[PDB]
Amino acid sequence: FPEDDEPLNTVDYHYSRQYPVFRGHRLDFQLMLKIRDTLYIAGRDQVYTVNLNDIPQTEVIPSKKLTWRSRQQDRENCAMKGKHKDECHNFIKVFVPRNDEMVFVCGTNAFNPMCRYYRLSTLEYDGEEISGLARCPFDARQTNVALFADGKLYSATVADFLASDAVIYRSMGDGSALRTIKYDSKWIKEPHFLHAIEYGNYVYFFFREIAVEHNNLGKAVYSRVARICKNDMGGSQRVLEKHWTSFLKARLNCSVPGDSFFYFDVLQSITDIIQINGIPTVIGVFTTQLNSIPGSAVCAFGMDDIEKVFKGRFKEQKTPDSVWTAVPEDKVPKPRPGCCAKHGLAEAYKTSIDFPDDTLSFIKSHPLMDSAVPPIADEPWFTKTRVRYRLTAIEVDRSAGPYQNYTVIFVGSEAGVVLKVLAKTSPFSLNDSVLLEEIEAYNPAKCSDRKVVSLQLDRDHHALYVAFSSCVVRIPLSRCERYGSCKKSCIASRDPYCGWLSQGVCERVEQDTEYGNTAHLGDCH
């Protein structure tokens, strides 16, 4: 079992308040998206723009601003519904551009979710309102996902004010409204959704939920990967009418090896498809259960290894009081459940409504694959276990280093600390992952609960915008000045963003980031 890494350099409060923060009554930050050289910040009542080309002064000053407050009668229906005044505000929770001009926006609207279309150029409310049901959450504190692929919108949230029905819902297209089976604990039981990604014929989803394979003990939480066909049109009249017919989900294996494999099963956040060492990977941040010993890990998977699981064997509960076991290879009905009509093992099917009743009624009572998805290279890439705080936000730079062949991962925290880690990905790269810098990134003065919510890489300006619950802090990717003259301190940090020049100063991009030898280096004081 490994041990906490030691930060090569620490950036404490005094060395970090020299960084700009965003505000604009408070802010109540929700999410952020980078388009071109502009970063969009959506929160309560407001959506803010910061131009990433303007080097900030004491504060980050917003340029353009979008405003969309909840209606008056919506503000009073919310009060009658018992919810407090601070909550009865329009918290923006969805912000996905459909094309290169217009952006799909949804807000909580004081627990009365609605959706709209805005233009990027102007941020003007143009057109007419659409209902946000099954698309945008009721509570601001809930998680949610939202994406556009091939004409149609793929949402994933809660649909009712009472917060019972969690659903994945496709609409806003030329097809009908497909959805998950309400209350069907075998399909989804008390989940918190976190992300989604289009790849091949499928939209792969990432969330956490209560696990049904570890029910013979406490109410555990397992990290799941689910998938759906894009060209699903629902089932026939008998089985899965208007319901998905392509719903397979698997479990994620984040394992410390040993005589008692140790698992991290709470998923906190994940990234998009990143090319690491030639193969498409997804990098995610895992913690332990709430009523457990605080511990955190970063596991990484690949699209290949996700797909392999789904052609593997299905999982069944033979009898109520038996263990989840494999489905016999002979009992997998033809055509391959999960396979998309007109493709692969079902190309003799024009639509998803043509599927046999036995193929449909199999996926409705065996939606969970057997196999778990392996993480690349067995054990996690980084662990931090001895400390009082949990890990949160993740961000990745696939092309870090002067040669752009080094994977530097940036991760958030609960106690306002951010870790910058050079990850050992391939075998021929390092001995193991090294914790480069520990940056306390929470500015007590400008902010307040100090929870980092998400991050967004501004690779074109060598920065990272750390997000908190009421403030957003612009953090450079390298404090190469903290060392400056001291060549020892410099290249001994092994930070690929820094280095040593023949001018005799530690700057950015001669360096040795691989081993980090202290040979022929003196000793500053």
Binding site: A79, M80, K81, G82, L133, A134, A159, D160, F161, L162, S164, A177, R179, I181, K182, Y183, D184, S185, K186, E190, E241, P320
Partner: protein, 278 residues
């Protein structure tokens, strides 16, 4: 295939117009995806029309429908609601159902399943089915339990029993017949009782459990229809007698079984049907 497990009433709308709503409840034998266990379908003057038996409010989220959760049938296999009587009263419609007990019965379907009789009430003017409410019913006399509903008749009591109960001449009364215990149902034991419930006392214990909710105490308690232990949300709303629910605090669970006034017991030759008038 059984009869007598289905019940309902027709309610013609405003005259001149061919619509008549029709509220119907029936068991479904676990086929919750095909058939709702309770709906509010529509009637039309032209019998061939395909809009017959169509729900009077329909959208992708809530309809004048009430499907059994696919979850509840998994926790216990052959659960079902048998619908005995149904009657129109004031501006509402009430049903006397008999469901499988989610509590006194283990998930194991050995055959020891106990049952629980419950009134149910909706509004005629509730398209989204928010006004739903469900209280257990029964009675006792000399420590003998009677909790297996058998038949019911809504009658105006005339002038004698009215002034006997303090009810106005327009207030109605429901006579009931309960079999002893909560066991077996398919062939209950002979011991049966003819009990009385006042329509007043039921409208009261309703405005009392839904006034108790809109204050935030306790929680809605329908283990088969709701699954997740949602709590009673607080609210600054003043309940009427004719309050037809809102998007929260519904469907609302009954905590204390409404007790009836026993009128007659027979321990030898069982009671089956009932009716009354003045």
């Amino acid at each position: 295939q059984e009869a007598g497990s289905m019940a309902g009433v027709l309610i013609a709308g405003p005259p001149g117009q061919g619509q008549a709503k029709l509220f119907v409840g029936t068991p479904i034998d676990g086929k919750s995806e095909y058939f709702p266990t309770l709906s509010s379908r529509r009637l039309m003057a032209n019998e061939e029309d395909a809009d017959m038996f169509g729900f009077v409010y329909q959208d992708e989220f809530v309809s004048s429908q009430l499907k059994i959760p696919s979850d509840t049938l998994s926790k216990f296999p052959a659960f079902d609601i048998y619908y005995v009587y149904s009657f129109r009263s004031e501006q509402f419609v009430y049903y006397l159902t008999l469901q499988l007990d989610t509590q006194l019965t283990s998930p194991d379907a050995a055959g020891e399943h106990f049952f629980t009789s419950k009134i149910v009430r909706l509004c005629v003017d509730d398209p989204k089915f928010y006004s739903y409410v469900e209280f257990p019913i029964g009675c006792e006399q000399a420590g003998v339990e009677y909790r297996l509903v058998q038949d019911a008749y809504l009658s105006r009591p005339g002038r004698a029993l009215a002034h006997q109960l303090g009810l106005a001449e327009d207030e109605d009364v429901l006579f009931t017949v309960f079999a002893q215990g909560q066991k077996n149902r398919v062939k209950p034991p002979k011991e049966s009782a003819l009990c009385l419930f006042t329509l007043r006392a039921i409208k009261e214990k309703i405005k009392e459990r839904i006034q108790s909710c809109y204050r935030g105490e306790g929680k809605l308690s329908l283990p088969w229809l709701l699954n997740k232990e949602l709590g009673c949300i607080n609210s600054p709303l003043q309940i009427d007698d004719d309050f037809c629910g809102q998007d929260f605090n519904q469907p609302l669970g009954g905590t204390v079984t409404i007790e009836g006034t026993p009128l007659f017991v027979d321990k030898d030759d069982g009671l089956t049907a009932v009716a009354a008038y003045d």
